[PDB]
């Protein structure tokens, strides 16, 4: 019930990698850049954006496991350990890969979004594969 990994990573990665500089991404059939506030897993019950949440469910659903190499690992580690509020959960293996189990409230960011989708599209689509 969202965009396609391939494009997802494309738009999300295009903003973060050069437009948002690792910020919060808004989802809803498209990806947007959030710099005003931020996030913290919040499910909009406190003071978050329905976007982040949705993006979290979409980025978490698409992955549902993936494998995250060394990059995606440091990826979540960065966006997660960046500020605070533990929302993403991770476990490493794959020699140089890790498994992404994340949530702890529904709210995602541009980086985190691209992170899981990097491993998502990587292991799932990879330049559109499904």
């Amino acid at each position: 019930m969202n965009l396609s990994l391939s494009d997802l990573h494309r738009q999300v990665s295009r903003l973060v990698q050069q437009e948002s500089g690792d910020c919060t991404g808004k989802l809803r059939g498209n990806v947007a850049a959030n710099k005003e506030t931020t996030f913290q897993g919040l499910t909009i019950a406190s003071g978050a954006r329905e976007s982040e949440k949705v993006f979290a469910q979409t980025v978490l659903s698409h992955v549902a496991n993936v494998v995250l190499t060394q990059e995606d690992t440091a990826k979540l580690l960065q966006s997660t350990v960046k500020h605070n509020l533990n929302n993403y959960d991770l476990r490493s293996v794959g020699n140089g890969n890790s498994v992404l189990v994340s949530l702890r409230s529904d709210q995602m960011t541009l980086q985190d979004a691209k992170v899981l989708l990097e491993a998502a599209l990587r292991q799932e689509s990879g330049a559109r594969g499904s």
Binding site: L3, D7, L8, R10, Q11, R14, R28, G29, N30, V31
Partner: peptide
């Protein structure tokens, strides 16, 4: 609906 095109 939401936005037309992403990116």
């Amino acid at each position: 609906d939401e936005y037309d095109d992403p990116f």
